Amino acid sequence: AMEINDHQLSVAELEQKYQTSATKGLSASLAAELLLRDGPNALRPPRGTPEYVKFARQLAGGLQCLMWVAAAICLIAFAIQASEGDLTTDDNLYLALALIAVVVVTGCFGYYQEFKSTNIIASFKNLVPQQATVIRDGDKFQINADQLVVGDLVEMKGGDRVPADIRILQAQGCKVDNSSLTGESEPQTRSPECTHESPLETRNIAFFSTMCLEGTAQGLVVNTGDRTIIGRIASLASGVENEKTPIAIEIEHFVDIIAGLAILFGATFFIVAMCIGYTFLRAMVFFMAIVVANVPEGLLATVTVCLSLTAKRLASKNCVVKNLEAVETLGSTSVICSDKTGTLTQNRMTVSHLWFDNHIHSADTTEDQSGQTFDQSSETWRALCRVLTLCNRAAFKSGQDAVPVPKRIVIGDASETALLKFSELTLGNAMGYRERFPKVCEIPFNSTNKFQLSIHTLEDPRDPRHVLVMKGAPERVLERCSSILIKGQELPLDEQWREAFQTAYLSLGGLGERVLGFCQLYLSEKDYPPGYAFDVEAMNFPTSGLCFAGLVSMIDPPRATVPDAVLKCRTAGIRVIMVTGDHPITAKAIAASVGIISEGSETVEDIAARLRVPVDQVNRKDARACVINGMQLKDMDPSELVEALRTHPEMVFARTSPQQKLVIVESCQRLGAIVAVTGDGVNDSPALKKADIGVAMGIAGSDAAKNAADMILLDDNFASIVTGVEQGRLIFDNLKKSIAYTLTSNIPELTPWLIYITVSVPLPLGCITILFIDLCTDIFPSVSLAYEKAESDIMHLRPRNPKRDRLVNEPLAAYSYFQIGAIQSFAGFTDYFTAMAQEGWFPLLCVGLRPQWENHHLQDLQDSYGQEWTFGQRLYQQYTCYTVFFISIVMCQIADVLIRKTRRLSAFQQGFFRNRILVIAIVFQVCIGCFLCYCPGMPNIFNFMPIRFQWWLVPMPFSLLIFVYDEIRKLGVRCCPGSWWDQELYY
Amino acid sequence: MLGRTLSRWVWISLYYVAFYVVMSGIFALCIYVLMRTIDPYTPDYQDQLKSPGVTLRPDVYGEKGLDISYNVSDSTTWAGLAHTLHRFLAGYSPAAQEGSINCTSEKYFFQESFLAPNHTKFSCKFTADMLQNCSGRPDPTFGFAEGKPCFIIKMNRIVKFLPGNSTAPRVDCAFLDQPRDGPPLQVEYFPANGTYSLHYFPYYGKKAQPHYSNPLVAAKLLNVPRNRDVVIVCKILAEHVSFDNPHDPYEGKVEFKLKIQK
Ligand SMILES: CCCCCCCC/C=C\CCCCCCCC(=O)OC[C@H](COP(=O)(O)OCC[N+](C)(C)C)OC(=O)CCCCCCC/C=C/CCCCCCCC
Ligand SMILES: CCCCCCCC/C=C\CCCCCCCC(=O)OC[C@H](COP(=O)(O)OCC[N+](C)(C)C)OC(=O)CCCCCCC/C=C\CCCCCCCC
Ligand SMILES: CC(C)CCC[C@@H](C)[C@H]1CC[C@H]2[C@@H]3CC=C4C[C@@H](O)CC[C@]4(C)[C@H]3CC[C@]12C
Ligand SMILES: *[C@@H]1O[C@H](CO)[C@@H](O)[C@H](O)[C@H]1NC(C)=O
Ligand SMILES: *[C@@H]1O[C@H](CO)[C@@H](O)[C@H](O)[C@H]1NC(C)=O
Ligand SMILES: *[C@@H]1O[C@H](CO)[C@@H](O)[C@H](O)[C@H]1NC(C)=O
Ligand SMILES: *[C@@H]1O[C@H](CO)[C@@H](O)[C@H](O)[C@H]1NC(C)=O
Ligand SMILES: *[C@@H]1O[C@H](CO)[C@@H](O)[C@H](O)[C@H]1NC(C)=O
Ligand code: ALF
Ligand SMILES: [K+]
Ligand SMILES: [K+]
Ligand SMILES: [K+]
Ligand SMILES: [Mg+2]
Structure with missing residues (x-):
């Protein structure tokens, strides 16, 4: 087990360490020796335990062992009686056979009770690349990814999964998908210059099994196999300590009670029989009878049958479970540690707010469009909607007319997809609106320009004017604009308007949202005839002094049911925690929206800002909420973690790694709590294995999460957690009745x-x-x-x-x-x-x-x-x-x-x-x-x-x-x- | 102070004492009412007494059955059999039969009224001498000395049971498996035919007839080959006595393995 610290080392230090060459790579003989040494570049699946061995444990237990002893007494009695020639007690043999049959049927019921048919370990092979381009002796040749060893100079291109943790040396517009690590599909740049001390957040470290979206990049291999980050995650997930479920604990407890009473009665009255004048064989038969009367023969089986019926009721709501013991844990759960991206949100950037008319409009973000809509009857709004329709290059997949708009597939940037879907939802056909306003000049987002510009001929042929439309950063458009659509009119810019714009930008940024500016200019037919080719490089457009339309912000929004589900879970006495890898500001925004943080509850920084008092003097006991990021949590000791957990009832962990998620789960568990974890990603899998019960999303979920979970939400309906809580409590009460x-x-x-x-x-x-x-x-x-x-x-x-x-x-x-x-x-x-x-x-x-x-x-x-x-x-x-x-x-x-x-x-x-x-x-x-x-x-x-x-x-x-x-x-x-x-x- | 304080222990104990006392009182009331309803002379039902069982004396049980083996030349082999037969007939001595009265009805002895002392019904006298030649007099060995042993067959008495009055119920003893060269077992019976006289029936119960003595039939075997293991089955030939119950071997018939040695 080694930690990555090579990202800080220079090329010379890497060369000395790995005896590699920054351009030539590894020699073939050295590569073969290192392969023989370290093994392949592939994850080792734990063998586990055999089926029949687990079955053998089922034929043991308190009641099982008592019935074995009782059948032993019966067989001994029958054999001794027969050896004397008496054969009248064939009933003793039939009793023995029936007790053995009861034991075996009970064992089958117990095996079926705890049985999972999922392989779990086999999930970490569809993420592993098969092929890997490697530079040995100065030749770029293709080989299987299993053969890579540390020090190999690997070249990767877009669309190909990264074959190992790689120290990137050369990069040309490379972007990766680090979802298996952070839960975020947001593309991350890769460049050789180190950006962070921690090997996770740096820009010059690609990771094993991360989809390289676009561009080409080169690098040296620093970790292979289980020594990689994904290898560590897979080892924690597949190989974790088996934990007894709460219903299993309760069953074993009451088996102890019954075994104690049975042994007590049997021994007491065996002694009584010996004193009052019975033979040893007769007192043994008496003890057998007393044990059989005290033991419940069908109880464990009826418990399994009740669990099956509860599982059927749950699965009728697309809530499939993987072992019948899981059907109860949620009713007993007192803590729900929850992932954010995909679990509490639909993992789709959508329009959240609009700023125009000096008003912040909230647009509906639910996936079924069942929510409250915003006012759309403003002239400024109509001009802004046209502009956001026009500044877009993304398109849908044709033939998806039946599939709802939010679920419809798009190609483009995340911002572009959100804007296109929002325009399609507001209007009839954004494709139609953009085609009927033909495009003559197209300036995409440029690093030097820092914006996107386009020139459009107006739809109405009576107006040959050309509409310029622009989209970019709020402050970066502020200096590029001079008037502004206010109340449906063109208004000049003043200090009051700049103050209002700045306040709007700061508000929308502090809600954990990416904000994009929008503006437009109309070009008269005087200077620009209809046959005026609008060249990009000529820059004959004024490109400045435009008219600001209105600001728009985007956020990944909660699912429609989730706020109600979280409020119901909190009413049922359950503490709800958000553990996420996203940024703290977005995490706090989502916690506030969903209901993890109540309205009125504040953090230490919130109190400090309100009082204009520094952080140190703010009393902790007054802060109802607490946002802790990964850096702080990493140096936080276990005692401090417990103290924080006690101090703040509404907790949000942000920027956290999978090991930190597991640490949080086990901290909650050590406090005598039954913990559920709800996740959908690979980084959630160790926590899903550690949790008392793990719940995975069905559609959005990944295979690792689904294999680690104990329960799956097939319909992706988070409110099924409330139903599971209700049914778990109900089955507990009815179980004790039965x-x-x-x-x-x-x-x-x-x-x-x-x-x-x-x-x-x-x-x-x-x-x-x-x-x-x-x-x-x-x-x-x-x-x-x-x-x-x-x-x-x-x-x-x-x-x-x-x-x-x-x-x-x-x-x-x-x-x-x-x-x-x-x-x-x-x-x-x-x-x-x-x-x-x-x-x-x-x-x-x-x-x-x-x-x-x-x-x-x-x-x-x-x-x-x-x-x-x-x-x-x-x-x-x-x-x-x-x-x-x-x-x-x-x-x-x-x-x-x-x-x-x-x-x-x-x-x-x-x-x-x-x-x-x-x-x-x-x-x-x-x-x-x-x-x-x-x-x-x-x-x-x-x-x-x-x-x-x-x-x-x-x-x-x-x-x-x-x-x-x-x-x-x-x-x-x-x-x-x-x-x-x-x-x-x-x- | 295991689970709860001492005062609470006293309270839960007192509650359980009250509960069990009340339940025991309810049970005692149920049994009192049951014994009030139970009739003192006739059982309510006779579901398991449809046909009477049959027993024999002397009763020596071997391997799940009546095994009687003796050697004629050694007296101590049959001393126990003779002693137990005498002990069984001491209850039929006329001193013990004093309570019963003589009868010559030769027909069912129906009685509807209690004419005997303290509200009882008459029983009939069966004495030792009625067995004549197997009655322990004048030969005290019951013929076990001379190889012709005398076996007394008795019928289990059942209240208000009539064995059919076409003719007196009779005993017929024979070998269970007749040897091909073997002659059929000849037995002399006492009384004549080995019949139970009809005036001993019906039995009215221990309360109605406290001095009742079952009639006896003495079967003296005469055709028992020496040094051979023979099996003999004695059946009761009455109309309402059936001996076809494989589950109960003594119902209407009795079998015993006999081996007379020399
Ligand atoms: C954990 C601690 C457990 C403690 C359990 C305590 C159980 C207490 C229950 C019963 C105790 C004795 C109750 C007896 C009451 C009888 C009332 C009575 O005065 O009746 C009269 C009869 C006499 O009749 P007779 O001869 O005149 O009739 C002849 C017919 N004629 C009259 C027409 C001629 O007297 C009779 O019956 C005498 C015979 C009575 C029956 C014997 C009962 C013994 C068996 C007891 C087990 C009961 C269940 C226990 C289960 C405990 C559960 C945890
Ligand atoms: C944690 C450890 C605790 C230990 C505490 C122990 C305390 C109690 C222990 C002893 C106290 C009772 C002393 C008994 C004295 C000896 C009685 C006896 O020697 O009797 C003899 C009869 C046998 O003669 P037979 O006519 O059957 O032979 C027929 C033979 N053949 C079948 C071949 C013809 O014995 C039989 O076999 C049949 C039974 C008849 C007698 C029953 C006596 C029992 C009555 C009450 C005991 C109550 C205890 C309740 C405990 C409650 C616990 C919760
Ligand atoms: C003989 C004297 C000294 C003591 C008598 C105790 C007797 C009456 C027995 C009969 C029923 C028994 C009780 C049955 C049920 C319970 C409830 C259990 O959770 C604690 C023990 C307790 C309370 C038992 C204690 C002993 C008990 C009360
Ligand atoms: C019967 O007893 C006599 C005298 O004790 C003895 O001589 C004879 O051998 C016994 N019979 C058999 C078959 O052994
Ligand atoms: C019952 O009757 C017998 C004679 O049949 C007599 O000896 C006895 O005294 C009587 N008992 C009572 C209580 O009358
Ligand atoms: C019955 O006893 C008489 C007494 O004289 C005797 O003659 C006769 O042989 C005996 N019957 C049998 C079968 O032994
Ligand atoms: C047999 O008993 C019936 C009454 O049960 C009686 O009428 C009949 O006469 C009896 N038969 C003889 C032969 O006595
Ligand atoms: C029964 O005894 C009588 C004597 O009264 C006799 O006539 C009859 O033949 C005998 N029957 C049998 C079967 O012994
Ligand atoms: F989906 Al997450 F941390 F919110 F992996
Ligand atoms: K039982
Ligand atoms: K039971
Ligand atoms: K789990
Ligand atoms: Mg996720």
Whole structure:
């Protein structure tokens, strides 16, 4: 890693350093040795990680490892039991197979959740030139760009991408496109004389992979491959530390909670089983059961499904995402570091203001022309519009009649394109207006002239007068003019008029705009007949004493939605920062226009100017805004960077390099903030990789930005950030609702087992049926809770605190487990005892009955009526208990999904049927319960019995009690916000 | 002070105590109401008792089934079988049958009214001697000494169950797989035909008939080849007893592997 400092060295010092020749170049043998040494002049793409290796990590985790351990216990139990010759527990093997299948399906869902299909690294090859003209031994011959080594004397011409960082020695009107570095397509001159200390801003350093627009230039190669500026940017972008996403952090946290509870329950009751007299193998099977009941089998999959549905909703607005985890980050985001050129503006110079009639007119600059227009009914205005139409050489591409005017393609200078599009928008056909006013003399912009002049014959044949029209710098036309179109008349020049003109020029310059002057003279037919050839070199025109028409300024304007989007983002509690490579004055203008800087907020320099007090004495705390350029930021230490960030809430970083963008992003992140970065260029790519979520523009964006981003705005609509914020917050709230619903039924699956171990009642629920609850009847209702509306004004809420606010916190877990789950357990046990007693087994007889109940040698066990039962009949009764418990859980889960729709609002208030998916999921849950109960063969297939209907009706009071008590809890939370009730029982 | 202060711990604990107390009270009320509705004499349903199970004595279980093996010449091989048969018949001694009354109806013993002491129904007397030759007297070995063992087959009693009254339900024991050169298993039954008399049915329950004793059938096998492993299946030939349940092997029929050694 070397920094460029060769731009300051002279030709002799370069020759001594690189052992090259300023005209001959490198010798072929030395070039081959240096190629062998340094490698090629090509970027090295990181290998990355294999697909299958990442998949292997997915088959691990808390729940994954628990299920592996549970399947291990099941397989060990089955093997030991079979080794003794007993084969009755084929159910143990089926349980093992199903748990393995759950693990693998969960792993596939997890792999699909974090999967990006983009290669990313392959973007930095379409920028690399293929061919490079090099002077070795004094001969100019063509070679591939990969072969260049430092010290090679390279010649480049216009239209050809620069093949390496080159120390320019000879230049003839060379101009480059340094967009990959600064984000600006404005052409930059290249000349041998050094203009700046920093190697980035100097005029004698061309850069690898920058399109050389025009002219020819010669130079020595100072850097090749990854040692180039673009190589550094590519290394930072492709190779950056992988960062865990906020939703992934939350998922791992609540997995820790569930794993802790599962291990706790399992170990506690394994110890209990050992003390109260169970074999080690039996206590192991108990531990397996407790783990299976505690682990959510379908939860991680339903989380992925909810993320997929949110991604679908987002992409319906052309907001495509690249991994499903990105669908949430924006809702959690509290800082948006934003690029300026292309992101906040449409990257098209357009007319911004006009100065005539002693008035500053604002022209509409939006791309769809949906904005406010300026007054166009002034005689001076009409004369000025003709003049700006006439002083133009640019033309459109023919056949683009359908394509709107602002998006229409032009060839010319940026100023010319802006002026042509503005004239086409004001009039019908600038081509028509300029052709019907034929041109007889054409003086283009000249260095010595310093302006553009042209002579035109007036359209009306009755007036053979020739109109001179001119365009240039305000001050440079001021000395070349004597009258001025004021209010539609020719007025002589006075000191008041010069003061007004100077004030206008200074105002328009201070808005970060390039200002161009405009003026015209009418040539009488007396001195100039119609057949008077207006020669350029003769200069028979007076060329002076003209009449000033009016000043015009141009700026790259914001997109139409961006001010509203930024204001909404700020209302949602999000800090908005502009990090840009453009000049500070333009950056501050755009920040003021867009809304990053509020109206009334000022900088240290603004306060100093207002008070006419120096910068030092201006108190920093009073300056709401701060503009920091790259030079200041470069020497600023991290402590000072943090201090500035705290001190000023509205921040603009200007003239910054890509490394500085990354430094700013990581500084914001180190302050405990979730940072989004919005960019479209190659220089934005390191920041886009560092950010929690990176958003790239679709049309205007470059391939590096798109490959580094996590989300793309296909339509280039910046207001989609607001939609993403809304949907991220919404999916967070609905995710915790769905998680609470899923977690609730874990307790009704665990409690039968603890009671079985402890009280020795016949087994109320089976592991197979537990899996049926988790994999079939729990999936649809929980996913359907992803379609809930927002209850409150989420977009007015402030961002969650990532340390404090969590997906699954202790209130959520406690409510779900120890209140709702407890009620559902009580429902299940009421149904169990009812079914047992109606069949002759009174509740007192069931207590302690497990040893005799599960005895293959006891074929005449008596019930509470004296009836004698075989083992097969007792087993079928046990299966009836299984089904009765399963149906109790299903009905209580219907009530639970009805109460999980809201956390702070009433079901009567939000409406029961607003969500069609929820009611369909309820109907589905009942239908699958009925099918499992009443399909022929099920008693032998999955241990489901055809149960009597009163046993369906028994848990409905408990369903109703769940519903009523949850509604009363929410009522209390709403009525008394500052209360212990709201503090402890809200979740 | 883990998460919250001590006062708050007390408050959340008191709330959870109140919640669980109320839920336990609701559960106790549900079980109280359920036991109030439950009828003390007849079960509500008999969904799993459609056909009675059948068990045999002595019950010695081997490899997932009734495996009975003894060597005639060594007495200690069959001492356990004899002792358990005696222990089972001590409950059918006439001292224990005192609570039941004698019957000669030879037809279903329907009773609609409680004429026995403290609102109960009559049961019929089945004594040890009714087994005659397998009854433990006058031979205490039950024929296990002489290679003709005496096996007692019992039917699982079900309330209000009638096994069909075209004729008394009967026992028919045979080899499960008849050897081609083997003669069919001849068994002498006690009582005649090995039938359960119809006046023992119906059973009205432990509360209605606290002294009920199931009828017995003693099957004395006479055609068991020595030193050969034979499988014998005993079925109940009643109209409403079915033995075609592959999931439950003891429903209406009982099979046992027998090996008499020499
Ligand atoms: C985390 C901490 C959890 C703590 C959980 C505590 C659970 C507390 C729940 C219950 C405790 C005992 C409740 C018993 C109330 C019974 C009320 C009663 O007086 O009934 C009377 C019966 C007597 O009938 P009888 O013989 O006269 O009838 C013969 C029929 N005739 C009368 C017509 C002739 O007495 C009977 O039933 C006696 C048998 C009662 C049933 C045994 C229940 C044991 C199982 C409990 C598990 C319950 C679910 C726990 C889940 C917790 C969720 C987290
Ligand atoms: C973090 C670590 C915490 C550790 C704390 C530990 C505290 C609790 C530990 C011990 C206290 C209880 C002491 C138990 C005393 C021994 C009981 C016993 O030796 O009984 C014997 C019976 C076995 O005889 P059988 O008739 O089944 O054999 C039939 C054989 N065959 C099947 C072949 C025919 O045992 C059975 O197997 C069936 C079970 C019957 C007895 C159940 C006794 C358990 C009752 C209450 C315990 C409550 C603990 C609750 C903890 C809550 C945690 C949140
Ligand atoms: C036996 C005496 C000394 C203590 C009794 C504690 C009993 C009643 C149990 C039953 C339910 C339990 C509570 C269940 C739920 C919660 C909320 C959780 O976020 C903190 C623990 C806490 C509060 C548990 C503490 C212990 C607890 C209150
Ligand atoms: C049966 O017991 C007798 C006496 O103990 C013994 O001699 C004989 O070998 C036993 N039968 C067999 C088949 O071993
Ligand atoms: C119940 O009846 C038996 C005889 O059938 C008698 O010995 C006993 O005393 C009676 N019990 C009551 C409470 O009347
Ligand atoms: C039954 O006992 C009598 C008693 O005299 C005996 O003669 C007869 O052989 C016995 N029947 C069988 C089958 O052993
Ligand atoms: C069998 O029982 C029915 C009543 O269930 C009775 O009418 C009929 O007479 C009985 N048959 C004989 C042979 O007793
Ligand atoms: C049953 O015993 C009777 C004696 O009353 C006899 O007539 C009949 O043949 C016997 N039937 C069988 C199958 O043993
Ligand atoms: F588009 Al930029 F800095 F504003 F790269
Ligand atoms: K579970
Ligand atoms: K990123
Ligand atoms: K569950
Ligand atoms: Mg850009």
